[PDB]
Amino acid sequence: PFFDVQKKLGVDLDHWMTIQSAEQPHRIPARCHAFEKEWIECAHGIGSIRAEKECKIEFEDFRECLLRQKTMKRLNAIKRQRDKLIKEGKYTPPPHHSGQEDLRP
Amino acid sequence: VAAFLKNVWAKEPVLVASFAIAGLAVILPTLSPYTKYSLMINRATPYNYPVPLRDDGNMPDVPSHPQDPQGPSLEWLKRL
Amino acid sequence: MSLVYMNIMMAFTVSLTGLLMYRSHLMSSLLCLEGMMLSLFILATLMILNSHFTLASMMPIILLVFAACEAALGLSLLVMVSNTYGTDYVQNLNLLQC
Amino acid sequence: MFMINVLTLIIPILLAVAFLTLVERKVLGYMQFRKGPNVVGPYGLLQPIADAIKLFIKEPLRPATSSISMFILAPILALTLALTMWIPLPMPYPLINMNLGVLFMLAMSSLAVYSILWSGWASNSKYALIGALRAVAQTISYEVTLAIILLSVLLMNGSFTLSTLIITQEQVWLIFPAWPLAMMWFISTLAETNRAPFDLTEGESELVSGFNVEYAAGPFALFFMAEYANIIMMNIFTTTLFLGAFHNPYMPELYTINFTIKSLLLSITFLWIRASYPRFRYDQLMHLLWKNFLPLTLALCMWHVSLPILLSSIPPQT
Amino acid sequence: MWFEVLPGIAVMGVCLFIPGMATARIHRFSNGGREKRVAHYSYQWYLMERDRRVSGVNRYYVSKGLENID
Amino acid sequence: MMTYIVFILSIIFVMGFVGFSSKPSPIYGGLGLIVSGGVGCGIVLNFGGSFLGLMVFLIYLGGMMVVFGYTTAMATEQYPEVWVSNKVVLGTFITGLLMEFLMVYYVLKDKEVEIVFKFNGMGDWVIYDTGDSGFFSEEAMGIAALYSYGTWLVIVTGWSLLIGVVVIMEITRGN
Amino acid sequence: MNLMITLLTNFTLATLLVTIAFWLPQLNVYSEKTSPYECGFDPMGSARLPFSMKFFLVAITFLLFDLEIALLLPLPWASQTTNLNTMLTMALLLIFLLAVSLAYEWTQKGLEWTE
Amino acid sequence: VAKLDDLINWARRSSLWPMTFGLACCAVEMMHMAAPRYDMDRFGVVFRASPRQSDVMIVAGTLTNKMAPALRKVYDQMPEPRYVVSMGSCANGGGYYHYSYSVVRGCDRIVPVDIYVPGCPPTAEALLYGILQLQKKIKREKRLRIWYRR
Amino acid sequence: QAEKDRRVLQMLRENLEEEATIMKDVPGWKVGESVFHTTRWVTPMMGELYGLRTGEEILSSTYGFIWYT
């Protein structure tokens, strides 16, 4: 019995916080504002089952924005390869990565 | 009500003083003349960036320069 | 996900196994309950601070607040036992069996 | 070079504690129509050195019934906690520039009672238990008032930073718009540091020594220096909060002279207070702070909430 | 008489003068004669890191002016 | 082993949680949880949460100072156990420390453990932002919009705390 | 980082004094100097007996009032908000709720002592 | 080790902390010594009520048979080094009540006494003289030299 | 703002141009591959920028603001 009285009386109680892509104080965006906007606007009013069956790509992109786990696997793979290539001894870091680089500004 | 007030002022003046301060803090901002001044002072603080807008050619209010007379000024806080 | 997330959730389930296996004292179980809530609070605050969700920043502390609003109740549910029994052992708390 | 700054912060406050013991005995004798210690050195300048060496060549005398873990852990934690909250104090430039130094002071002041509780419970005695219970009641009394005093005084500052507290003094002191809160804050600092008439833990007539009655020399001196660093630092904090001085960025000598003199005068006033009044009962401690202090500070808190809206005087948060 | 406390308390004044002053003097050494750049928010830190990245010596207190550009 | 400061603080968090999860005595459990809360507050400060870390610090200090007063008031035994005065307390403490070091060795070796969900071995600093929030902190406006945006939440929180006061008054009456 | 250095230095200075106070002087202990102090007589029982403490409600309501403080503490930054009327009204409302709890404590005989 | 012996003898003798152990007339005489007229606190002598933080003990009054275990336990709880100063005649040899059935004939039988102060009650100036004699006895101690010889 | 965008693009280009010279003999890998289904720009996480540089830059850049007193 989800008695949605927030729409019956027209009073906003907790719709201003429930979603990451809502109105924020001093207009500060979150880390996945665009992905939230895409996932809401693609999956609006068509039902949860059709939203899961059809809007899976933008939800997957949003979950990858939030968790960033595929980027972690990428960084882990390149870092293990880097550690291995240093350990056998056929890799030398450039001066830019080593620290003496004189950054842009 | 004078006898009751004298009685509580004689017994415990701290409660009378606390309730007087509470009543003043309740009823005075509703009679304050500078509350709207506080409203515009808080609203006029430039926290984030004032990004411009695209032009369709029909706008009489927004300026093209910060020093143009068109647009809102802040003379009221400068004088006060 | 990450590493500190794993540590915090493992702390939560460690404190859960601490609560779910008693050791003959009520207030120690209350401490384990507040530990489970500590893990919950730490996880929620870290999740928000990673995801830059500013407007949800009220939820951790308020969560924390409500926990104290029940935790003292647990303390208020202790001395009453101490007002009937001499101590607060849970093996003495078996009157409700008939 | 932060090590040199840390050492020069932490050693001369211990020397200040020792000479505070000196001038404590001297002045406390002087309002009692007698001289102070003046035999050991010229005007008794060598009394703190003799007191410090004497306590450190005695026998520690650990009790058998005492749980040795918290017994050895309480005084070091007390001295560290009395030492670790000196950093956010602007002097005129603080050691660590924390944006929320008031919250740090509040939390480390809440932690300072735990040494008293662990010293009361670690030693197996009735007097230590009674002292721990009275310390608990003292914390109950003072915390719920002190937090609101600090918030309501801080409401005109605009932020929790202690560095911006020196900016607000540039026109007038905040003791003029918050003199009642100044009285509340002074009584709260009287209550927190466990000084008479709000001692209630190191009682001489009620108990023998209370929380450290089983504490022999060596570990006992740590509580002494912790309490005296606490009172000196608390008076410095009160001076910065209410009687902040004129700061010039080109010459910090003026502000160092001014706040040193003001905090020294406030500590002399504390010494003057501590031996002119009878000791309060601890049942009247929360028959006063929970009864007379709390409604007044609630009224003044809502008044200071509604006052910058009234006069259009909202302070900047930066 | 009473004024005999006035020596000893004066020593405490020195014990309340040596720490804080030293910090200010330390701030006149590690920062190259200026005060320590008080960082309170992200933009102050970004400006200080900008000075660190433009100075070329990896020190923020080495401030270069309009003579640096041509 | 420098940028693993969040990892080290989390390991001390789990160590203190295993330490007080043995439930030896309320004072020692409070000590273990307070060490855990100290390093958790250190985690939150190291992630930029000054206010939240200091708030959980102050709240826990007050709450288990009350808990200390209660265990010294009523719930006390004649000979409290520290950690080794009883067998199962030390057994479960050593057991929890052994599992803690077990997934420590599991996460520092293959850098990807699978306990329910999958977990990586890098520090969380990789997910932290590269952008600057100007002249302000975002959590500060979170707890500032607590009063303006947060109407229903503050109303129900205040009503629940008032109800907690009246309930705690009503429970320990006796008659 | 500097906070960690200050904490470590303070702990090092604290724990060095007790070590100096302990292992430097000569120890000489018998089974009377380690005895508990009861004004020159033997203790009656142990100190682990449950205290019949009388301010249990005062400690619990200290906790509750500290959580009231936790609600009332982010008020200064709310001074920079735009919607000032809701801010002022609900800060006054929360302070009034604190005062209502205190007044109910006062009337229903809670601030006094048992026995 | 001769000069280090000179240091720790100066530290102990200039910060003597007696304990509030009086029993009789002689306790009131001690309180009269602690008055502003004679001012014990000028010599580094401040009263401390706990035996665990006291250096010396001045036994003032009559030690009865109901009091000997209490005095013995209080003396045994004091940390080393400890000195005992007998006072009056009651704590010296029983004095007026030497032949009584319930008075210990001198408190030497219970605790080892370092300094004997004669009087009934001894004058506070004489008591100050006895305390100064105890300080001079502490001054000529030879602990580290004897340790070096052994 | 212009400096920040130019530096971010420069650091990402530096990280991409050295990914080619390290991962060649591995099988079935496409260099510079994104993990997003869309081509829209995203704000890069800190591991993508300084994940190949020294650790001193890591504690001076990630925790540098928090650890500066």
Ligand SMILES: CCCCCCCCCCCCCCCCCC(=O)OC[C@H](COP(=O)([O-])OCC[N+](C)(C)C)OC(=O)CCCCCCCCCCCCCCCCC
């Ligand atoms: C910080 C700067 C320096 C501060 C001063 C330092 C030097 C002076 C120190 C003096 C000694 C202090 C320690 C000893 C006393 C300790 C006990 C104590 O303080 O008890 C508190 C005492 C206790 O009172 P009591 O002991 O009399 O209690 C009796 C109570 N009845 C009558 C019910 C039986 O007072 C209070 O609790 C009152 C709180 C302070 C009141 C401040 C009022 C300010 C003005 C308000 C407005 C007035 C105008 C009228 C209303 C107008 C409205 C618009």
Ligand code: SF4
């Ligand atoms: S010696 Fe004399 S003055 Fe002292 S207690 Fe005995 S009778 Fe009294």
